[PDB]
Design an enzyme around this catalytic site. Structure first.
Site, mmCIF file in Angstrom:
data_model
loop_
_atom_site.group_PDB
_atom_site.id
_atom_site.type_symbol
_atom_site.label_atom_id
_atom_site.label_comp_id
_atom_site.label_asym_id
_atom_site.label_seq_id
_atom_site.Cartn_x
_atom_site.Cartn_y
_atom_site.Cartn_z
ATOM 1 N N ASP A 205 0.792 -1.227 0.000
ATOM 2 C CA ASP A 205 0.000 0.000 0.000
ATOM 3 C C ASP A 205 0.829 1.285 0.000
ATOM 4 O O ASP A 205 1.726 1.471 0.823
ATOM 5 C CB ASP A 205 -0.979 -0.003 1.187
ATOM 6 N N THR B 44 -3.972 4.799 -5.122
ATOM 7 C CA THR B 44 -3.140 5.794 -4.440
ATOM 8 C C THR B 44 -1.775 5.864 -5.113
ATOM 9 O O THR B 44 -1.188 6.946 -5.223
ATOM 10 C CB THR B 44 -2.954 5.494 -2.922
ATOM 11 N N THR B 45 -1.281 4.710 -5.571
ATOM 12 C CA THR B 45 0.007 4.647 -6.254
ATOM 13 C C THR B 45 -0.139 5.368 -7.590
ATOM 14 O O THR B 45 0.627 6.281 -7.905
ATOM 15 C CB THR B 45 0.437 3.189 -6.512
ATOM 16 N N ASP C 298 -9.721 -1.455 0.441
ATOM 17 C CA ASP C 298 -9.693 -0.911 -0.906
ATOM 18 C C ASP C 298 -10.817 -1.551 -1.709
ATOM 19 O O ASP C 298 -11.499 -0.872 -2.469
ATOM 20 C CB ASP C 298 -8.346 -1.196 -1.581
HETATM 21 N N1 LIG Z 1 -4.705 -7.820 -14.391
HETATM 22 C C1 LIG Z 1 -4.097 -6.628 -14.483
HETATM 23 N N2 LIG Z 1 -3.141 -6.434 -15.484
HETATM 24 C C2 LIG Z 1 -2.476 -5.232 -15.632
HETATM 25 N N3 LIG Z 1 -2.772 -4.204 -14.759
HETATM 26 C C3 LIG Z 1 -3.706 -4.332 -13.747
HETATM 27 C C4 LIG Z 1 -4.415 -5.569 -13.572
HETATM 28 N N4 LIG Z 1 -5.224 -5.390 -12.546
HETATM 29 C C5 LIG Z 1 -5.064 -4.140 -12.078
HETATM 30 N N5 LIG Z 1 -4.131 -3.515 -12.828
HETATM 31 C C6 LIG Z 1 -3.638 -2.144 -12.674
HETATM 32 O O1 LIG Z 1 -2.794 -1.977 -11.538
HETATM 33 C C7 LIG Z 1 -3.009 -0.646 -10.979
HETATM 34 C C8 LIG Z 1 -3.402 -0.733 -9.474
HETATM 35 O O2 LIG Z 1 -2.275 -1.360 -8.789
HETATM 36 P P1 LIG Z 1 -1.973 -1.141 -7.237
HETATM 37 O O3 LIG Z 1 -0.745 -1.892 -6.855
HETATM 38 O O4 LIG Z 1 -3.123 -1.541 -6.394
HETATM 39 O O5 LIG Z 1 -1.736 0.436 -7.100
HETATM 40 P P2 LIG Z 1 -2.695 1.668 -6.887
HETATM 41 O O6 LIG Z 1 -2.370 2.352 -5.600
HETATM 42 O O7 LIG Z 1 -2.589 2.625 -8.010
HETATM 43 O O8 LIG Z 1 -4.185 0.956 -6.816
HETATM 44 C C9 LIG Z 1 -4.077 0.010 -11.858
HETATM 45 O O9 LIG Z 1 -3.484 0.887 -12.851
HETATM 46 C C10 LIG Z 1 -4.750 -1.166 -12.558
HETATM 47 O O10 LIG Z 1 -5.398 -0.891 -13.798
HETATM 48 MG MG LIG Z 2 -5.456 -0.962 -5.750
#
Ligand SMILES: Nc1ncnc2c1ncn2[C@@H]1O[C@H](COP(=O)(O)OP(=O)(O)O)[C@@H](O)[C@H]1O
Ligand SMILES: [Mg+2]
Ligand SMILES: Nc1ncnc2c1ncn2[C@@H]1O[C@H](COP(=O)(O)OP(=O)(O)O)[C@@H](O)[C@H]1O
Ligand SMILES: Nc1ncnc2c1ncn2[C@@H]1O[C@H](COP(=O)(O)OP(=O)(O)O)[C@@H](O)[C@H]1O
Ligand SMILES: [Mg+2]
Ligand SMILES: [Mg+2]
Lengths: 517, 517, 517
Positions: C55, C88-89, C384
């Site tokens: 996170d 958030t990332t 989340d």
């Molecule tokens: N199966 C997937 N393949 C590629 N990207 C994905 C997949 N599932 C989620 N994502 C992407 O990963 C990102 C979210 O990753 P995460 O580590 O939770 O960071 P954040 O804080 O941005 O939610 C989003 O840009 C989302 O579209």
């Molecule tokens: Mg996420």
């Protein structure tokens, strides 16, 4: 400034490299204690305190670990001890190995993502193989329940009386054990351990009752009661006061007396309430005024004051008595029974033995031995012995020991590797190989020939079967089942979970940010 | 960085090598006090306090040991003192020696595993052989009990009067000794030592009662009472107050007087309850108002206050009196008898002697001597004296002294080695050879030719039989039985237990991890 | 002097260049955790405490940032987490990338004014494109709501059970969900998480009621009620007192008893009011006197004391009970229902489960896991999953994942660049390029060929459409809609909002004046 000074950080190679090293270091610190022939460690606390044990959980705990990745290895044994009771060294040793073989794959340039995934597949597929190869036994078949307990004790210092201690542990668990839904459920909090120096480990016994470190509160009270009708009162046998601030205004002489008498009366009335139930033994949690001590004495009632709340509950579960908050409402149905409640002076100390209870739901194991150390280690041995018995009664499945299960998992998990194929297969095969440090370090700590020995074991096992492992006492491979050397199916299943998760959790940290201490 | 900086750690050779060295060092520190000819050490503590003793237990305790392994030697002497009361120096020496010969086996590359197993077979077989060769004597044979006690006193400073002391010791233990189920049971807590400087160790005596360091509380009370009817009151002879807060509101002049009188009465009424039982001697655990004292004095009753709870319990056991909490319920059946109760000014200090009790269940030994050190050392001698007498009455078995049991153990244990064979046999043979430090260091402290002398004793013993040992007074071998120089079968069985346990404990530790010392 | 000493200051180039560096640094720190393949970080705070997480919110918050501009990057994830709960990332990464491409334009000598303005336009137009392209779904479509949740959990640790957690997350929000004005409105405070170490994550579950970490106040009370009629009392069940100072003055013995009896009654009367409603279960916010507990016990009522105000309210909402301040006015209408209220021991811990409720307006999710860490991270994942399922129900508009939305905003926003033209066109062009770090750093963390991948995607997207993005598990482009891999239209809208807001905020600072950092 930008980011606090005296604050370190590592990434990629560095991060993973250091983490794996720290992890491996800790793991190798305890592997020297694995098995019946494993060694002991002397941990010297900064306050001069000395602890000599074979227990991984205790060692990892007492040792002051600094590196974070190493502290995480403590959680492995911590989780294993709290779920299977035994196999804490095993879980940590395998976690370290998994990390060593894992770094090998990293050096080969394989993406952490692949290693993790291949490890998860291997981990998940191992549970599967174990659930399968497990020898389903009868939940209370005292035979194997005695073996499990014994095999466990034969892994520590106290193996000297593996016979007695195993028996006390199977007996202790079978008693407090509960079953009202079809299968057993053991709350080990219902097995108190009493450690008293002096004597030999030979004099250790199961007290189907409870032992309390208190004395009989009054000189004139019975120091022994035959068929005791016990009362557990959790109210203070003393002159009650109003919640509302209150004070006495003596106005004429005759009052000094009248008042004191008024309190004696109140006091005596409380005592009378206890006697009328026919109770000859009373354990009070709060205090006991002197007069109330006197009235209770005159009725020939044995009383103990300031009893630990934990003790009161053990007394309740053992004697069948009901703890009461108001003496006024105490009835004979609240009283419990003990075949004998006596005050004995054990090793200079006075203690109260509430033994011979009906069908105790809580019991005590009195541990005797030459030194404090002998005692503490026997308690440790027993706790593991009790915990494994608990597993087999709830699970009803067991496995051969001496690395026999990990050898099955290795030999097998390599086929699973082929099937998976690719980069993953590399991680899977490495996982299957890591699992061999158990048979390996078992033969090592035994002084045997690691290399050559590990060849015979996989040989026999491939031929003879699932029961082939190493017997440190034999110095050669053997059918662990025919030798009755076995362990809980839960102990292996849990080591694999604990280790593989600790491994994967580290193979996932690509950055370490440690501030100033 | 796994461990904190300033933390030391040692493994394998290092660990063992240093532990064994620290053990052996401490062992050689006390071996110079073994036997009758042994020497004494002077211990000067930081506070400036000076202790001069021959007693192993005191020395290992007063000396500030720091190395861990060296402290585990203090434990040996502690266990020994709590089980057989004597042979502390012996158990420690045989421990250091067992480790020395053990290391020699390590140097030859014999796995610690082998040494541990062989040392266990040696220790186990050693008990067995001791149980056998044990000279079964009569549980109360005044004869041998008088010997056991004297042989003991002769090992220390106090042998100048081994005569008197041995008598006082056998006499004292026989009195408090309790049996009613077939065999004896001695609770040495029923024997109090009272030390007073001045006079000669010659004036030491056994008071078949109790000596208390208190004074007659009132000037006008009796300082001496023939045939005393004694009352033990554990209640304060002072104006009782209510638990509930209270205060007096004087409203008119005539109140001052009447209120005081009302208290005098309360006081006198308590004194009356005591007088009406016939008691002419009262020992009160708590305090005594000045008026209660006066009334007590008028009835010609002798009273003492603030009497130690430990004292009350002794007077109770010594006089047959019962302790009471309420003076209102003191009956004449609660009183006890003492032929004479008198306050004597022993060495400028007033004390109270309760002597000529009926049948004591508790008894006091008054110790006299020129200096504080003479006194302390005699008490230490007496303590081992009383503890060995306790051993025979409970065990009913003895053995010859002067290392005769060990010489026999050596010769015999070695044979056992042959039949066991293998590497174990090397461990067994060494264990056996280690036991010879007793005869060895006995002749040595005596000033005799160790080498030669030890050849003779093993010779005689091989011929003349199990009773041949060294007689530091004869300067040659002798039949210890015909000499009457013997010791409890417990002392030797316990030395072997303690020492072999410790030797093996240390032989198992392959890693030491310390913080600040 | 002029300014305080040890006070730094930067202007124009310096100021802007440093702030953009600091900002970019923090961004590059967290970007390694983006997406399903993102890595984790190990954070060791000054007190040794270890936090292992994926996170962003936690990492930026746990790390002690010193530089002002980096601290502002914290507010970004802070705002993002508070409005969309996820991405958030994504928001921090895009905000740094925005500041990077923005410095390029600054180096090129373009006045900050031009960049700010073109960025504000690129941002305004960005929302527009999103609201538009947004795939409008049914506010409560069970299907998509399960997807949105499972997709969110995949990007973290516990994605190993994305299955279960997804389910619990949807149920939990649907239940507490409130929608009377047409569309929904979810107050996530009505969803409580409960973490208890032990078991697998498999045992995690939804409790249509509440779980409290308290136990039954008295030993004699029921440890389980079938069809509880719960009463919520926020009044102290103990002897009341007048606000005006008061004190009882005892003037005669009988008073000591009459006054205590008076208070007993008072206490018994309160319990009577509670019983006369038919309540068999009472939760009390304040304390409960000892007697009040006894009466309550006799009536067979299960009572708990000192219950957290936050818990009281969750019970009120879970059962339908009404909190009361005065027991005297408690009626049967103030009671709530619970299909079962039982005290269970979970991890040696005593807890009360108010489960089986009617139509709970509050609900509890019980989180189970091997280590403390496994749990904390599963909870984070759920917060989340629940926060995103919240967005969809309130918004009813989803989007495809895998950078699909950003790729669309990139291609498109470039057109906008044209038509706006001039210097602003350069800012709007760079802003649209910036939005590519998402598909970029997703393919990177996965271990793919950034350059090459990012081309197959910008391609496929151009030919296939809005739903084309990168699938880290697929290692290639894909239709995120056919794969169910989607996210809240709010997540994206708020990310852009947050990032650009921040980027522009920094771009506007041309002077920084600090006193000590
Ligand atoms: N199966 C997937 N393949 C590629 N990207 C994905 C997949 N599932 C989620 N994502 C992407 O990963 C990102 C979210 O990753 P995460 O580590 O939770 O960071 P954040 O804080 O941005 O939610 C989003 O840009 C989302 O579209
Ligand atoms: Mg996420
Ligand atoms: N007789 C035996 N021969 C060889 N190995 C044994 C024998 N008995 C037990 N073991 C093995 O020793 C290990 C347990 O050793 P121990 O020192 O107690 O550590 P742990 O904490 O893992 O139980 C297990 O792998 C078990 O199978
Ligand atoms: N008269 C004696 N001649 C030779 N040895 C003796 C004699 N008396 C006692 N011993 C020996 O001396 C040892 C006891 O010496 P001591 O200084 O008291 O130490 P410990 O603590 O072992 O009793 C015993 O081994 C005992 O057999
Ligand atoms: Mg074990
Ligand atoms: Mg001696």
């Amino acid at each position: 400034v930008i980011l606090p000074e005296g604050t370190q950080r590592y990434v990629g190679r560095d991060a993973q490299r250091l983490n794996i090293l720290a992890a491996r270091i800790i793991a190798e610190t305890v592997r020297t204690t694995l098995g019946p022939k494993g060694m002991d460690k002397m941990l010297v606390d900064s306050l001069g305190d000395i602890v000599v044990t074979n227990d991984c959980a205790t060692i990892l705990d007492k040792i002051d670990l600094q590196h974070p990745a190493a502290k995480m290895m403590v959680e492995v044994a911590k989780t294993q001890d709290k779920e299977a009771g035994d196999g804490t060294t095993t879980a940590v040793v395998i976690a370290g190995e998994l990390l060593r073989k894992a770094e090998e794959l990293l050096d080969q340039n394989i993406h952490p993502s692949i290693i993790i995934k291949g490890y998860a597949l291997a981990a998940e597929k191992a549970q599967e193989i174990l659930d399968e190869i497990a020898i389903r036994v009868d939940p209370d078949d005292e035979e194997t329940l005695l073996k499990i307990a014994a095999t466990s004790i034969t892994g520590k210092n106290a193996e000297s009386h593996k016979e007695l201690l195993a028996k006390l542990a199977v007996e202790a668990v079978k008693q407090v054990a509960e079953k009202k839904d079809g299968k057993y459920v053991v709350d080990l909090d219902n097995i108190k351990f009493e450690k008293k120096a002096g004597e030999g480990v030979e004099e250790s016994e199961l007290v189907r009752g409870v032992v309390i470190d208190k004395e009989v509160v009054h000189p004139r009270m019975p120091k022994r009661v035959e068929n005791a009708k016990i009362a557990l009162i959790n109210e203070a046998l003393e002159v009650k006061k109003t919640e509302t601030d209150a004070k006495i205004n003596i106005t004429s002489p005759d009052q000094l007396m009248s008042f004191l008498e008024q309190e004696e009366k109140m006091l005596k009335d409380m005592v009378d309430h206890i006697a009328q139930t026919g109770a000859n033994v009373v354990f009070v949690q709060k205090g006991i005024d002197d007069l109330a001590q006197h009235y209770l004495a005159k009725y020939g009632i044995m009383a103990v004051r300031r009893v630990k709340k934990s003790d009161m509950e053990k007394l309740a579960k053992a004697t069948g008595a009901k703890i009461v908050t108001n003496v006024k409402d105490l009835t004979p149905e609240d009283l419990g029974y003990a075949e004998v409640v006596e005050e004995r002076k054990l090793a200079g100390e006075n203690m109260i033995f509430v033994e011979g209870c009906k069908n105790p739901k809580a019991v005590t194991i009195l541990i005797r031995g030459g030194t404090e150390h002998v005692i503490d280690e026997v308690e440790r041995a027993l706790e593991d012995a009790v915990k494994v018995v608990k597993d087999v009664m709830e699970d009803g499945a067991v496995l051969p020991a001496g690395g026999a299960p990990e050898i099955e998992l290795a030999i097998r998990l390599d086929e699973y590797a082929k099937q998976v194929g690719g980069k993953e297969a590399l991680a899977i095969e490495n996982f299957a190989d890591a699992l061999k440090i158990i048979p390996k370090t078992l033969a090592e700590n035994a002084g045997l020939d690691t290399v050559e020995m590990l060849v015979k074991v996989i040989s026999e096992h491939k031929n003879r079967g699932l029961g082939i492992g190493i017997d440190v006492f034999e110095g050669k491979p053997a059918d662990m089942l025919e030798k009755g050397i076995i362990e809980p199916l839960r102990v292996k299943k849990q080591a694999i979970k604990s280790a593989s998760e600790a491994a994967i959790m580290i193979l996932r940290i690509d950055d370490v940010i440690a501030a100033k201490a």
